[PDB]
Amino acid sequence: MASGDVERVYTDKSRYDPGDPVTITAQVRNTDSIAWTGTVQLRIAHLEDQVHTASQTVTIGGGQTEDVQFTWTSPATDFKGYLADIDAGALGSGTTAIDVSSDFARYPRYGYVSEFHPDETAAESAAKIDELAQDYKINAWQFYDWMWRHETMIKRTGSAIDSTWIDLFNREISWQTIQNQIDAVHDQNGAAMAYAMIYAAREDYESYGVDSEWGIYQDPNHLQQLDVDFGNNSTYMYLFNPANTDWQSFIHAQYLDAINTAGFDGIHVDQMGQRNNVYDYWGNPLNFPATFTPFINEAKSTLTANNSDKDRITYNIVDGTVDGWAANEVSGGADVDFLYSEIWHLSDSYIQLKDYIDSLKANSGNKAVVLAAYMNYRENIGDRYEAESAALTNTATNNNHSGYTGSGFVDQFADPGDAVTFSITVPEEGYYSLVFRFANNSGFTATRNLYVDSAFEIELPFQNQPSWSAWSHETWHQVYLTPGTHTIKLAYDAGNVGAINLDSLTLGTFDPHSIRLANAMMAASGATHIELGEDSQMLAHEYYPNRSKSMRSELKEALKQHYNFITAYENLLFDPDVVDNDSGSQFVNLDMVSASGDASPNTVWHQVKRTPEYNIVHFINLANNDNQWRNSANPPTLHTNIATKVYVSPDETISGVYLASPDHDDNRTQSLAYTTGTDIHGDYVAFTLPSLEYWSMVYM
Ligand SMILES: OC[C@H]1O[C@H](OC[C@H]2O[C@H](OC[C@H]3O[C@H](OC[C@H]4O[C@H](OC[C@H]5O[C@H](OC[C@H]6O[C@H](OC[C@H]7O[C@H](O)[C@H](O)[C@@H](O)[C@@H]7O)[C@H](O)[C@@H](O)[C@@H]6O)[C@H](O)[C@@H](O)[C@@H]5O)[C@H](O)[C@@H](O)[C@@H]4O)[C@H](O)[C@@H](O)[C@@H]3O)[C@H](O)[C@@H](O)[C@@H]2O)[C@H](O)[C@@H](O)[C@@H]1O
Ligand SMILES: OC[C@H]1O[C@H](OC[C@H]2O[C@H](OC[C@H]3O[C@H](O)[C@H](O)[C@@H](O)[C@@H]3O)[C@H](O)[C@@H](O)[C@@H]2O)[C@H](O)[C@@H](O)[C@@H]1O
Ligand SMILES: [Ca+2]
Ligand SMILES: [Ca+2]
Ligand code: NA
């Protein structure tokens, strides 16, 4: 009676230079009561070939987990993905990708850091960076809102760097915490990108060395500078002209200060997106999107000059779509290391998004593409607990304003001593996003004290709404919980203010079905997705700190598989010589399973691609779902034993048919029995796909 499982498999770096040693670690647990002794096998593949094998015998104590390590000298050829497979027999097996790349910008897998707390220890910094690297092969990190001011990024008193500073949303940021994270990025061979704006400065900028003449204005008479109003009569961003060389000088020196003082590898340059009828200080009207490429290219050569090992840069093409505002300009002319675009509502369907990605590749000579595409945005999804069915304390149920869910809500929630108290029951250990749906027409922000299992947690704000029947679910707070039952109590306490009605509490939950389909479509079209950060947090909103949704562990497990898959098969997905095969949907036939070539809803979408060495067919299962990438989705209709025919040239050479999927068998390639044939439609290759859930790739 011998038993156990392989819990985790990871490498010591997210990215290796050719010829670097790779340490591959299997975290193996003996679940038996007595110590196990046996052989642990390592098998490393590159696509369909087995390129290395290794063995060791190892003794693991009963109830213990032990790190089983192998070492491997990466082959000397650059830009190669590999799959490492550890097999411990009765104690299970596990895989991880190895990425050999001298330049991460060829295969960016971009995460984020948004938390810089003085109380973050260096263990905590390291652990969050290590988790993203080990689990999802993250090789670059966008540091969001690390800076003090948009124009004065590091806060100094004299020539001393202050220890902490307060950012635009009143968050305390530590310099040491930023540094420790940057260091930990660098121990993973990761690149640390420093968030910055192309053209923003904070209020009172004239006293920080920034001339108002450099600005951009809504009129010809410099009356009204373009700005972002944060709604408190002091906190503003003011905008400037990216073509102004005096502004370029000022802000490019900030970028350099950031590289040289903090150790950042480059700059993640952001912008607000489309602006019209923009003038400079003198009333000369600007072709605004044409000002970006010159700013970026000048920023790039200034970086390279400063430090050519830390000259990285990207620019956010906001509101991405084919021929979108600034899109052709940047992709076509800007010297960014990889392309980045935040997708809003002009590429809502899978096919529109595919076409946008294809266009970026075609303008750019196939630069890598990273998409910011905030999944399940605004949807109040998860387990719901209606407030009317909660335990009430000097509060009551009612239903005299519409917009509630269930049968009613709680009101008479306006006095110290009042409280609502939910009994939630959760399936597993981890983060839960407490999302409150509520009404407040008090004229101003109300507050309530949240308690969790009787202990105080935090004061929550509840913004004011136009009426008592306009509801909001913008009040959230994330908490970590053990499995089972827990007490979540909103309470009116002395020092809290306003009044509210409480519809419900939802445990904000990212939907795996939609997220696996989006990631599959993106990789299959040659793009990756910025979505993971911190300690397996996921972006819910464009303000990266927003924790209104949490991932459950099935989603974490599936993203681990997916990110490893797109690393191990990076050569069939992201190399510049990976191209759509001509023609369309008449190349591929699935017998008795409705199918499309164009991401038609409720179909198995097949997409044919080619390298000089390989023919690639992607199968993405949209059965039981629509053609929109963002919104939560149903579990796809599972398919089994699908008789497939792929039509080929007579020209084409074929000595095997190979199958890999992030949904099955730990990303391992499987060799499929096939036949060649000829019918009226042309020459074909015929095989059976054992199954199709979210995404499967065949190559030959
Ligand atoms: O999480 C940090 C907070 O933690 C504590 O409080 C937790 C509570 O936070 C909120 O409530 C307090 C909040 O209330 C009001 O704001 C509501 C609003 O807050 C958040 O969003 C803020 C804004 O985010 C963006 O703008 C900031 C962004 O602007 C520039 O960047 C431009 C962006 O646009 C491009 O398209 C880019 O691609 C993109 O990447 C860019 O971000 C700038 O360069 C950046 O530096 C800057 O960060 C967005 O544009 C705005 O629309 C947002 O308003 C929430 O995420 C959002 O859902 C919500 O609507 C109030 O006005 C504000 O002052 C207060 O901070 C939550 O609502 C609440 O649930 C939670 O309990 C702590 O107490 C806080 O101090 C801390 O902030
Ligand atoms: O039993 C209570 C204990 O459990 C949790 O630990 C899980 C979590 O803890 C660490 O991270 C702390 C903190 O790091 C950053 O600041 C992140 O941005 C935050 O999301 C995060 O909470 C650890 O390093 C993580 O790997 C791990 O996921 C609680 O969160 C603990 O505070 C608590 O003591
Ligand atoms: Ca309700
Ligand atoms: Ca959908
Ligand atoms: Na069919």
CATH of residue 612: 2.60.40.1180
Long-range pairs for 427-430: beta carbons < 8 A, 24 or more residues apart: 427/483, 427/552, 428/483, 428/552, 428/553, 429/481, 429/482, 429/483, 430/480, 430/481, 430/550, 430/552, 430/553
Q: Is 181 flagged in the annotation as binding?
A: no
Q: Which residue's CA is minimally distant from atom 27 of ligand 2?
A: 535
Domain match, 522 and 569 both: yes
* Resolution of the coordinates, Å: 2.6
For the beta carbon of residue 504, count every other beta carbon within 10 angstroms: 24
Q: Which of 114, 167, 169, 203 to mutate to test the pocket of ligand 1 (most atoms within 8 A of CB)?
A: 169
Domain match, 600 and 620 both: yes
Residue where a domain terminates, one of 62, 85, 103: 103
Domain match, 254 and 137 both: yes
Domain match, 164 and 253 both: yes
CA distance 69 to 318: 44
**Buried-exposed string 399-415: b where 16+ CB fall within 10 A, e elsewhere:** eebeebbeebbbbebbe
Q: Which residue's CA is minimally distant from atom 66 of ligand 1?
A: 169
Q: How many domains does the chain have?
A: 4
For ligand 3, the distance from its centroid to the CA atom of residue 389, given in whole angstroms, is: 8
For ligand 3, the distance from its centroid to the CA atom of residue 478, given in whole angstroms, is: 21
For ligand 1, the distance from its centroid to the CA atom of residue 241, given in whole angstroms, is: 25
CA distance 372 to 204: 32
For the chain, count helices (H), then strands (E): 9, 48
Domain match, 391 and 479 both: yes
Candidates 247, 255, 252; CA nearest to 280 is 247
Q: What is the CATH number of the domain that holds 467?
A: 2.60.120.260
Whether 171 is in the pocket of ligand 1, judged by its Cβ within 6 Å, is: yes
Single-letter code of the amino acid located at 476: W
Candidates 431, 510, 506, 434; CA nearest to 476 is 434
Asked whether the CA dihedral 254, 337, 326, 350 is positive or negative, the reply is negative
Domain match, 45 and 167 both: no
Domain match, 214 and 333 both: yes
Rounded to 5°, the CA angle 82-14-523 comes to 65
Domain match, 109 and 99 both: no
Q: Which atom of ligand 1 is nearest to the CA of 319?
A: 36
Element (H, E) at 294: helix 292-306
CA distance 686 to 150: 58
Q: Which ligand has the nearest atom to the CA of 585?
A: 5
Q: What is the CATH number of the domain that holds 550?
A: 3.20.20.80
List the domain range (segments joined by +) for residue 212.
104-380+511-576
Q: Which of 124, 432, 537 to mutate to test the pocket of ligand 2 (most atoms within 8 A of CB)?
A: 124
Quick one: the chain helix, strand, coil %, rounded to 5?
20, 40, 40
Element (H, E) at 512: helix 512-524
Q: Is 619 helix (H, G, I), strand (E, B) or coil?
A: strand
Element (H, E) at 413: none
- Residues lining ligand 2, CB < 6 A? 115, 117, 120, 124, 127-128, 131, 480, 534-535, 537
Written as one string, the DSSP assignment of 78-139 is SSEEEEEEEE-GGG-EEEEEEEE-S-GGGS--EEEE----TT--HHHHHHHHHHHHHHH---
Residue where a domain terminates, one of 534, 554, 576: 576
Domain match, 581 and 606 both: yes
Domain match, 188 and 310 both: yes
Domain match, 640 and 534 both: no
Q: Which ligand has the nearest atom to the CA of 547?
A: 1
Domain match, 145 and 250 both: yes
Residue 316, beta-bridge partner list: 340
For the beta carbon of residue 358, count every other beta carbon within 10 angstroms: 17
Rounded to 5°, the CA angle 586-346-580 comes to 30
Compute CA distances 136 → 10, 128, 556, 564, whole Å. Answer: 9, 12, 9, 6
Residue where a domain terminates, one of 531, 555, 576: 576
For ligand 4, the distance from its centroid to the CA atom of residue 627, given in whole angstroms, is: 5
For ligand 4, the distance from its centroid to the CA atom of residue 520, given in whole angstroms, is: 13
